[PDB]
């Protein structure tokens, strides 16, 4: 069909905003994957960060998958975009890679924050709750 | 020039991981509702993400430079039937495998391609995609365990 | 007497065709996993029958004289029902020489007949989805 | 053709069909030897247990090759399993020498099979050998 | 009372019912029928009906009656045609066993009532699946229902 | 035109049906004798337990015979299980003497089956009479 | 119909009539249970005795609906009317109302058992005797 | 002597706990007496004989949990006599209820009050014990 | 009837027996004693004697008589010494409960329980209780770990 | 001295159990004798060979719980000789079954005397035991 | 002549079963409360009983005449301790094994049981039985418990 | 002499002790030929793990002989395991050739060990080496 | 490449250790000793030591050396007195094998540590004095 | 000297003993940084829980070292766990530089400890460093 039988109280701005959130956290998982195998190189070799940034890459991958499950569950439609490459491959120092990993988080959290505000203005208790419990 | 061939292969694995991720949540839709098709392709999405990051460690072990690119979105947004998503997976897996044999000159795919072919012929013999009963039974009797 | 020597070769011929039919269903353009499990098991059963016959000759001062394991009549049994009917007819010829020489045979002959009857009643060989459900529900468990 | 066939030269397929028949011929030479060492006039009931186990083991190789043939899109064409050179191996040591020959003859076909898979550029098949 | 003649009638009918189920069971064991769980199904009803008869021969003794057995007549059909038909015959048979039993109570089981309800359920399912014309319908019912 | 029938003679097929009814008859007689000892004026609780078990056991023999019929390819034709010769077995020992004499005749009837299967070259049926 | 044997029309009717009575009794218990749930009426083990009793009565109706389909009768459901009030005074009137609500519900099954005995339904008789 | 586990457990707390064991077992006994009164065929109120019997068990098992609490903090269990209920016959389906309405009342008053020794003597473990059970 | 006053006398005795077992159960729960399987054991017998009492309640109503309930008066001890002493006390208690039950029958649960108590008393003695604290520990683990 | 578990168990109630034990063990011996008589090639009456062997085992199990009962009630087990059966050659299947029933519940006249002994000595436990088994 | 010897084995094997039966319910007594000792000899009595019955079939399968004699009572009513009863069992099994070997002259099971009883007697002695009642209690649990 | 010794001659006890050492010797002759065919210059990977299995089997034979010694009551007295006749067997056929003389060395002593158990009337020792040798 | 003979010494020493443990195992299988878990423990050690020698034989072939085998000398004892004594001899044997393995260099440590735990426990329990102490260690630690 | 000590230098034991304290100090600083990002002033949960994971990691590394000390026969001597240099880490960046400093410091101590085992010829201690790090 072309009309969702389950879609109810799921706004046009909510459906698009989590699709905009699908690709942001898929991008984040690719940013952390790039950093993980930077601290895995012989030129740096920081196994504590090479494994954390790999684990965080899996975490952002699961965050997107649960958001994709939220799209089909609410009746919305997943719209996938390209996953842009990170800003660099040679993250230079081991502190610059972390400088970018800090800036990236205060934009992902500053997208769930606006997402939750949107879920509040459009009166979506289910979407509000999903954000507060994930 | 075995360094850029690794980087092309990690990109082909990551792109194909985005394809199986797209296929998986297609069968999770309320107008498709094939839970085991969703489980199956989500697994292949993870298995090839593992392939990609195990070629990134191989780029480091051989003292190369990892050059990442954009992970382009899959071609289709809907994959129509379960038979067509399985035939697209077969085509995708042979292209990832052909570009992997290009890299061995500078198994998992053979095992996966064989399994994808076993699924395509079964679905066709039962009557997919016309028979909605056929894909339902295949979902629970073959992709169930 | 020296009829045992011919049964040894017959059971070995039986084991060979059962091996051939097993790995037919292993093909990608066929893909009947439990049909392949089933006929591979029969291949290892008839092989065990031949070996116990080879010891039976040693237990009465016989001579294990040996001939070629001939090639099966078909490389292609492209139907689950056809492979069962070929297996049913072959077991009744493997059992044919046993009754000349003079249990587990009539148990297999009976089982093959149960399988043939089901597949025909279900729509095989023209109907797919019938050999699929038989693979999953009868040959599966 | 087969929907799964990919980077699988015909020579690789036919040489595997040949190896399948050679493995089954070997199991059977080992089966004739086993029940030779089992007769009451020979009565070395120790190689009988060993040759019979390798009779089973050499056939398992052929079944692994038949599985490999389908996995790569090749087609299994079985041939006749010819009788062993004799039924009476005379002495027990003469049969240990014929069995010693066959192990090298079979391993030689595998070295040619591995050589065939390198000239036509085929991993996996190269990795199938190295059991 | 006149209950002694009613008990012995009920005894013979249950023994007869056990024989009908015995005939149905090994009909589905035939190689031209080949229904494993259909055969197991009637074989268990056969032993349960026979169990009902032996408890009735015991009830005759507790009240001080005289067990008078008769011939166990052969079932009506040798060939039971199909699975849908065989259970409809079972459905009616259990109602026939239950009917004369309801008389005996006035001159023991929910087992009769629940058996009837179960047999009724199966006739409904088999008929809605396409039986007896659909050999796949009886095959699937033998697996997914009579396999529990 | 059976599908499984092989080396199973026609006069051997009715020999089973005639035996199936006979086992079902002994089970009936055993059932009748069992509930004779269950009475108040007899009070032989041990022999009632025994014959009830013999009733179920001779029923299994018929069930194993009917199963044999389908396995070989014969068609089961059931007949009337005729009533035991009496309902008042008088004394317990008279019931024993009838139960003793009961199927010392089937055991002979079982042996005539073995002589029947031997005359018709049926080793499987000969082997089956091991119960 | 396929299984209906010796099941009178008034038996089928009284069963359906009994089903609604059990559901109604469950609703009254539910009301009194959550009346004892109040901030003020602090009788908390009479809020979960009646709550359990409410589920006990909803279970009785379920087995009655099961009996209807099993005997061959057809289930016809009616409205579950409001309890006679929401404010149950305090612990006692609830009990006094619950006590009277009990054996009018309880031994309308005597009338059911009287119906099954005059109809000579041994199965329906055994059902009243066992579950009650 | 003083228990090796005795810590911040005032004598008034140990005594007030011992008072509860006897009262809870008294409540267990009165519910028991009432339960088997609804059971006799002069009354025939089964769905109240079963509830009160279960309430009888639950008041005894609170005393056991109190007895476990007494050992857990170093206190020593000194039980007392379990006295008979005010009567054996409450011939009425609801005087026993008004008794039960007001036998439930009086443990929860003493439960609300044992909460004073736990607070006024700065005993958080005994405070939080009542707030949970 | 003089069975009504006799049955009610058993009801009070079983309830008294259930109290003694409850008292002994949480004596072994003390940190001074610390024998948990001894605690679980007498706690189980405490719940068994109550069941025997509650089963005499409905017997009284079924026979037509009426319940006359007295005080569940108090166990003789608040300190039950050791495990052997408590088992020896529990044995004397069951025989009294059995004694009154038998001469109430004048108008096997107890007989079996008496055998189990005497068995335990025997084992504890032959192990060296109560002088050997190692014995009551091992008896707590290997026998009362049922 | 006396056992710690003996209560309401008379001395005559004890010796009767002991004499009962030997009687059941004797019956298990007789059945075992007749059982392997019908196992003989000369007889080939397999029917009663199965039955008499089972009855011999069940008769021994009967004696075992009499021994358990004895220790359970404070009594003391005193075992005696198991006298051999009346014969080894039981002539015919009738005579063996003839001698069987004479013995089969020759046991249960003393068993019914033992019940009379349990009632006249006021042994409700011993009564309920006999009635059950 | 070998026929009369089989009849001897039958009576001694049946005698062996009664001795073990006697030993079994000796450890069932309330003053000797060793349940696993009681299970052990009861299992042995059943085993020796099965050995006797298979000797009677041996008489029938070779055309012998089963000549049963008395099953004499065991030498003791009180078997004292668990070590002593275990020593008498080792004694009895070997005597049964003796006559069993005279039978074959004119089997494997006896050697296993004798070897185990020897291990049993050895362990109980090293542990300090019969003096240490703790030793026969701990052996009961840790060896004969399984 | 042990508690469990019975009908066990010290000729057979010495014969067992001797056969124990004989199978341990064959265990090492097979072990030596095993890792001779594991050599790169030989590379007979088939016999290499066939002999390694027989090396473990002969070891298990002596273990069951040792258990048999304690079981009958005898006393295990071990001896040195003499080295194989060589380390370089050169050909594979001489290695097989020695293996046939070695196995008929241990199968001959077994027959004599069987005659010893028959001359002395040991049914258990006969049944032992009969069972699986 | 007397490291070829240094492996050859170790091969014989591991086989000697296997033979010693084999002797200890069936000492505790004797009817007058009767400690089946002691018997199991030393038999498992015997197999593990035999395996140690067999890989040493494969090691030398992979290094292009010659496997030179010598006689497996019989143990020093037939009677091992008790469990504590057989344990202390095992601790002595393992450290013996271990020091010869370390010289070949230029697990075993777990076996030495475990035997050290066993010796210590048997001491504090009352071995070899208390047969009860060697019985309970058999059931609880070696069980 | 322990009964299990063998080829275990006193310099190895002391170095491992002070290695334990370094891994426990590393557990303590990772515990400080973790609950610094946890407060709302900084309010980043990504690093707050991974640093708590690292704190558990280093604590487990010290425990595996303590087990190694007893396994070789050495004796565990523990010292004070010095507090982290500060409890306010200024910002997330500074703590990431501090974490990177003590990370290579711990690894440098491992590179020293591995060289000590090579120079003292300790294959077991070498294998330990190579495996777990």
From Swiss-Prot, chain B:
In which residues is Fe cation 2 bound?
48, 93, 109
- Where's it mainly located? cytoplasm
Q: Where does Fe cation 1 bind?
A: 13, 48, 51
Annotated GO MF terms: ferric iron binding; ferrous iron binding; ferroxidase activity; identical protein binding; iron ion binding; iron ion sequestering activity
Q: Which UniProt keywords apply?
A: Acetylation, Cytoplasm, Cytoplasmic vesicle, Iron, Iron storage, Lysosome, Metal-binding, Neurodegeneration, Oxidoreductase, Phosphoprotein
GO CC terms, sorted: autolysosome; autophagosome; cytoplasm; cytosol; extracellular exosome; extracellular region; ferritin complex; ficolin-1-rich granule lumen
The Ferritin-like diiron domain extends over 1-127
Reactions that this protein is recorded to catalyse: 4 Fe(2+) + O2 + 4 H(+) = 4 Fe(3+) + 2 H2O
Site positions for Essential for association with cargo receptor NCOA4, renumbered to this chain? 8
Q: Which cysteines are joined by disulfide bonds?
A: none
CDD domains named in the record: Euk_Ferritin
| Connected disease | Hemochromatosis 5: A disorder of iron metabolism characterized by iron overload. Excess iron is deposited in a variety of organs leading to their failure, and resulting in serious illnesses including cirrhosis, hepatomas, diabetes, cardiomyopathy, arthritis, and hypogonadotropic hypogonadism. Severe effects of the disease usually do not appear until after decades of progressive iron loading.
Annotated family: Belongs to the ferritin family.
Can you state the subunit structure given in the record? Oligomer of 24 subunits. There are two types of subunits: L (light) chain and H (heavy) chain. The major chain can be light or heavy, depending on the species and tissue type. In the human liver, the heavy chain is predominant. The functional molecule forms a roughly spherical shell with a diameter of 12 nm and contains a central cavity into which the insoluble mineral iron core is deposited. Interacts with NCOA4; NCOA4 promotes targeting of the iron-binding ferritin complex to autolysosomes following starvation or iron depletion.
Q: Which PANTHER family match?
A: FERRITIN, FERRITIN HEAVY CHAIN
Please identify the protein, giving its name as recorded. Ferritin heavy chain
Could you tell me which species this protein originates from?
Answer: Homo sapiens
Origin organism lineage: Eukaryota, Metazoa, Chordata, Craniata, Vertebrata
Give the gene that encodes this protein: FTH1
Swiss-Prot record, chain C:
- Protein residues bound to Fe cation 2: 46, 91, 105
Q: Which Pfam family would be a valid example here?
A: Ferritin
List the InterPro entries. Ferritin, Ferritin-like, Ferritin-like_diiron, Ferritin-like_SF, Ferritin_CS, Ferritin_DPS_dom
User: Which consequence is recorded for altering residue 70 to Q?
Assistant: Reduces iron binding and oxidation rate. No effect on iron binding but the oxidation rate is severely reduced
* Cellular compartment(s): Cytoplasm; Lysosome; Cytoplasmic vesicle, Autophagosome
Q: Which Gene3D superfamilies match?
A: 1.20.1260.10
Annotated catalysed reactions: 4 Fe(2+) + O2 + 4 H(+) = 4 Fe(3+) + 2 H2O
Q: Provide the assembly information.
A: Oligomer of 24 subunits. There are two types of subunits: L (light) chain and H (heavy) chain. The major chain can be light or heavy, depending on the species and tissue type. In the human liver, the heavy chain is predominant. The functional molecule forms a roughly spherical shell with a diameter of 12 nm and contains a central cavity into which the insoluble mineral iron core is deposited. Interacts with NCOA4; NCOA4 promotes targeting of the iron-binding ferritin complex to autolysosomes following starvation or iron depletion.
What name is this protein filed under? Ferritin heavy chain
Q: Which organism is it from?
A: Homo sapiens (Human)
Upper lineage: Eukaryota, Metazoa, Chordata, Craniata, Vertebrata
From Swiss-Prot, chains H, J:
What the record says about family reads: Belongs to the ferritin family.
Q: Which domain of life is it from?
A: Eukaryota
Q: Where does Fe cation 1 bind?
A: 24, 59, 62
Which molecular-function annotations from GO does this UniProt entry contain? ferric iron binding; ferrous iron binding; ferroxidase activity; identical protein binding; iron ion binding; iron ion sequestering activity
Q: Which BP terms in the Gene Ontology apply to this protein? A: immune response; intracellular iron ion homeostasis; iron ion transport; negative regulation of cell population proliferation; negative regulation of ferroptosis; negative regulation of fibroblast proliferation
Q: Which GO terms describe its cellular component?
A: autolysosome; autophagosome; cytoplasm; cytosol; extracellular exosome; extracellular region; ferritin complex; ficolin-1-rich granule lumen
The record gives the effect of mutating residue 104 to A as:
No effect on iron binding but the oxidation rate is severely reduced
The organism encoding this protein is Homo sapiens
Query: What's its EC?
Result: 1.16.3.1
Q: What is this protein called?
A: Ferritin heavy chain
User: Can you say where in the cell this protein is located?
Assistant: Cytoplasm; Lysosome; Cytoplasmic vesicle, Autophagosome
Which keywords label this protein? Acetylation, Cytoplasm, Cytoplasmic vesicle, Iron, Iron storage, Lysosome, Metal-binding, Neurodegeneration, Oxidoreductase, Phosphoprotein
- Chain positions recorded as Fe cation 2 binding sites: 59, 104
Enzyme class at the top of the EC tree: oxidoreductase
How would you summarize where this protein is expressed among tissues?
Expressed in the liver.
Assembly, in brief, is: Oligomer of 24 subunits. There are two types of subunits: L (light) chain and H (heavy) chain. The major chain can be light or heavy, depending on the species and tissue type. In the human liver, the heavy chain is predominant. The functional molecule forms a roughly spherical shell with a diameter of 12 nm and contains a central cavity into which the insoluble mineral iron core is deposited. Interacts with NCOA4; NCOA4 promotes targeting of the iron-binding ferritin complex to autolysosomes following starvation or iron depletion.
| Phenotypic consequence of residue 83 to Q | Reduces iron binding and oxidation rate. No effect on iron binding but the oxidation rate is severely reduced
Site feature Essential for association with cargo receptor NCOA4: at which residues?
19
Q: In the UniProt record, does the keyword Cytoplasm occur? A: yes
Q: Could you list the residue ranges that cross the membrane? A: none
Q: Which residues form the Ferritin-like diiron domain?
A: 7-133
Catalytic reaction(s) noted = 4 Fe(2+) + O2 + 4 H(+) = 4 Fe(3+) + 2 H2O
